[PDB]
């Protein structure tokens with residue numbers, strides 16, 4: 001409890017390509033890098049020689065593979081994959097010293113799924129069985145882990161973002177506990193509303209302390225989730241409209257093209273001259289543990305302005321605006337998570353946030369987690 005030195009710094013990534021952990025599958029163990037995804041519930045790995053892949057799961061080499069004689073076709077909004085289901089022995093080398101028999105979807109065909117130039121070959125869906133494909137009878141990895149070992153039913157994530165000049169991203173996934181070296185101040189917990197996605201309820205939104213004053217149901221239409229497998233902070237369309245109006249206003253001392261705010265074009269500045277100060281902070285108040293009690297998390301432009309390094313057309317420091325409109329509810333992606341140490345306390349059906357010891361900031365502002373606040377009618381903020 002509280003100290004897991006073997007798991008610190010077990011995440012790696014490249015800016016724009018997500019955060020992955022080393023895993024092994026099969027006997028003898030085959031090493032793969034696997035994207036950590038709290039927004040899905042399947043363990044799915046490349047199993048055929050797709051040209052984008054560094055390596056792939058070769059079931060024929062594993063003496064412990066067991067075929068489930070069942071396939072799955074998984075379409076996303078953009079892109080898809082098709083796989084064959086089976087079980088095999090799975091371990092996390094820089095994780096708990098255990099090996100479990102887990103479901104594995106061996107990906108045999110995919111479209112717009114793997115990233116050309118990335119260093120990961122599969123995804124680890126850490127959410128609940130309700131959203132597993134093809135149905136909720138396919139036990140997710142973490143459920144198998146907890147069922148088969150003495151690993152406590154919780155994990156925590158510290159995602160450490162980037163800044164010019166481009167160095168790799170990194171962080172820590174603490175499996176079965178919390179490492180108190182990874183955050184400062186106190187953890188504040190918000191309830192997991194329902195165990196499918198890691199669904200939470202946002203009760204108030206501010207831009208530089210200025211309340212959007214929308215009906216709070218709007219903030220969670222049709223859900224709000226914590227998702228390490230999405231870059232952006234995605235906001236419901238109506239909320240995005242209000243938020244971006246407020247952000248434009250706060251930053252009006254400089255004018256940027258309309259397309260910038262829509263993520264249709266980059267903005268660039270001469271190296272080292274990014275005007276962080278003109279951009280507002282963004283605060284989400286989350287439902288607390290106690291009736292009529294909330295707490296607030298606050299992120300900086302350092303989180304929501306993403307550095308884009310691979311721009312052969314330009315010579316400067318270029319950025320993408322990574323708050324975007326949603327039709328799937330609020331998505332608290334890497335833009336939120338990079339500010340915080342996030343504790344997925346499954347045992348107690350709650351998510352903890354604390355200020356990350358690694359988050360990107362400046363001399364004037366830092367990410368924050370603050371409470372308690374008094375917030376009435378928070379139950380009305382959930383969409384039904």
Ligand SMILES: C[C@]1([C@@H]2C[C@H]2C(=O)Nc2cccc3cc(Cl)cnc23)N=C(N)OCC1(F)F
Nearest residue numbers: 016017018039040076123227228229230231334
């Ligand atoms: C299944 C799925 C795939 C696995 C997600 C994915 O590929 N994510 C990413 C792709 C590219 C750059 C990224 C950067 C960061 Cl920081 C995170 N994820 C990144 N999971 C979620 N949660 O939402 C999208 C999805 F398709 F449903």
Ligand code: NA
Nearest residue numbers: 146147149150
């Ligand atoms: Na157990």
Ligand code: NA
Nearest residue numbers: 180181183184
């Ligand atoms: Na601490």
